[PDB]
Amino acid sequence: APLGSTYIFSKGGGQITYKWPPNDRPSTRADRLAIGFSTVQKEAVLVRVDSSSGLGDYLELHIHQGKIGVKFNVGTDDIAIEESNAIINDGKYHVVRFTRSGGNATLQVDSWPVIERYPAGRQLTIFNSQATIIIGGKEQGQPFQGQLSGLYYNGLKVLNMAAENDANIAIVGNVRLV
């Protein structure tokens, strides 16, 4: 189960935001995103990384009809991958792992088979000018309720950073440490 900081998200919702310095936003050709979670929800946004580049690039981990999935867009089309079978909303700890290299991507939950997505046609490869990581909710999305831990995004252990009141972190709403 979890290592390090855990946040509980209670009814009504809350959101932790990591905001990169505006003159030092990363653009990446490959990404790794993982998070640990426990919940009984059927619909929730867990994590979303948004860009400031006006190109619309994004990466989102969410639960839909009780199943964990990823949707992302690095410039071409919206790519959606769902782990359609793993039970993830039994209130027990689960880990979801996402990777991307260019336009290709994988998703895996727990010890279930890795899902490998190789989209057809022209694909862009850079996740441009990443501006914010939002955790536990988003504008136009349904807020997470449960516990989140072990958020790793391209090397950043975001929830541990939140736990020490990193200066790039903001926390709002109904969410608290452990």
Handedness of CA 160, 165, 170, 174 (dihedral sign): positive
16/105 with CB nearer Ca ion = 105
Question: Is 66 a residue that touches Ca ion (CB under 5 A)?
Answer: no
Alpha carbon separation from 86 to 89, 94, 95 (Å, rounded): 9, 10, 11
The response to whether 50 counts as a known ligand-binding position is: no
CA dist., res. 159 & res. 149, Å (int) = 7
Closest distance of CB 106 from Ca ion, Å: 19
Closest distance of CB 25 from Ca ion, Å: 13
Closest distance of CB 76 from Ca ion, Å: 8
Eight-state DSSP code of residue 161: H
**What token pair was written down for 11?**
């009814």
Question: Is 74 a residue that touches Ca ion (CB under 5 A)?
Answer: yes
Closest distance of CB 107 from Ca ion, Å: 20
E strand or H helix at 149: strand 146-153
Footprint on residues 30-49 left by Ca ion (CB under 5 A): none
The response to whether 88 counts as a known ligand-binding position is: no
The response to whether 63 counts as a known ligand-binding position is: no
Residue with tokens 């790519």: 79
Question: Is 126 a residue that touches Ca ion (CB under 5 A)?
Answer: yes
Question: Is 128 a residue that touches Ca ion (CB under 5 A)?
Answer: yes
The response to whether 74 counts as a known ligand-binding position is: yes
Sorted by sequence, the CB contacts under 8 Å of residue 131 that are 6+ apart come out as 19, 20, 22, 25, 50, 51, 52
Question: Is 79 a residue that touches Ca ion (CB under 5 A)?
Answer: no
Q: Which stretch binds Ca ion (CB under 5 A): 14-22, 88-96, 125-133, 141-149?
A: 125-133
E strand residue ranges, 4-145? 6-19, 30-38, 44-51, 58-64, 67-73, 79-82, 94-101, 104-109, 115-117, 130-135
Give the residue, chosen from 31, 57, 60, 83, that forms a contact with Ca ion under the rule CB under 5 A: 57
77/82 with CB nearer Ca ion = 77
Total binding residues for Ca ion by CB under 5 A?
A: 6
**What token pair was written down for 155?**
């090397």
Q: Under the rule (CB under 5 A), what is the footprint of Ca ion?
A: 57, 74-75, 124, 126, 128
